Amino acid sequence: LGNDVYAMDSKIKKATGFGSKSKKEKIRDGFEENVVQVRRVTKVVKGGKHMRFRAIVVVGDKKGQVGVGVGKAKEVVSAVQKAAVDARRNIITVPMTKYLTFPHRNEADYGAARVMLRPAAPGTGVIAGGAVRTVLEMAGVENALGKQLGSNNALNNARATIVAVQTMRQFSDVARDRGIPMEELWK
Template sequence: MSQQNRKFSQADENEEAPEFVEKVVHINRCAKVVKGGRRFSFSALVVVGNQKGEVGVGYGKAKEVPECIRKGTEQAKKNLVTIKLRGDTIPHHVMGQADGGKVLLRPASDGTGVIAGGGCRAVLESVGIKNILSKSLGSNNHLAMVNATMDALLQLRSNEEIQNIRFGEVAAEV
């Protein structure tokens, strides 16, 4: 394949999903000691979202950094989930847990902004949340924090769903 064709094919791939925001949370370098020295490999934790309620997390591994970021992005796009929001915040407070990481998310009023750190912030901004308070508890491992944040967001329910759970279908009719 000539250089010119490669440029066009890469441009076509990028035009597929321009609405997605890609955030690299963490890149890890791993070394394997062999007879001749050290062999390095890389892993990347990537969060992808459309800032309209969809987000996905991917973890890519490769011998070079750009390749592991690409693999992580592809995996994140395959793992997209839809999150229920209320305006630009979440409907209720929620606690998520994954491995040793715990994340507490609380809705916030307009003008508060995203008060979160590290991987938690990347996930919340990719979803499209503008006002939220968060507290990370337990482990501060990047992967654990991202997965705990995703767990918390997947627990969110709309007001109608909560009423149906509490009172059954009768409440929806009234």
């Protein structure tokens, strides 16, 4: 057994102080953050209006990995940042097809937001509205049809889109589930 002071100062030197070490590590994560929405929410106190910013932000690699996140702070920058982290720990993967599109047609429901996605022919681009379109674009889906029915709220539509593309079943897996060869379901 080596002394307690040198080994605990080794776990103290290995976990670095937050006041002596500045932060930008994020581009080494291989991710890009896109700010969807910036709103000023308010808590009210006996003094007056206590102002905050809420940022809804999605992150993707444009390579088939995407996530949504929501954050709150006093400054635009900080909320952006929190949103970034909350998203990064919430992240999932969208099933893709050789042509960069969806396996099939799907609906989704989150709150009052309903979302309609359907696959497209290559060269149609991504046609959709703000939340759905940023989510899908950041996932890297190249050709997709989508329409949000029901409500318009950015956040809910994002989450609904995630619910959509999460339940998407790729053909290999339905072949495996049903217990039937691919070529038989192809027909």
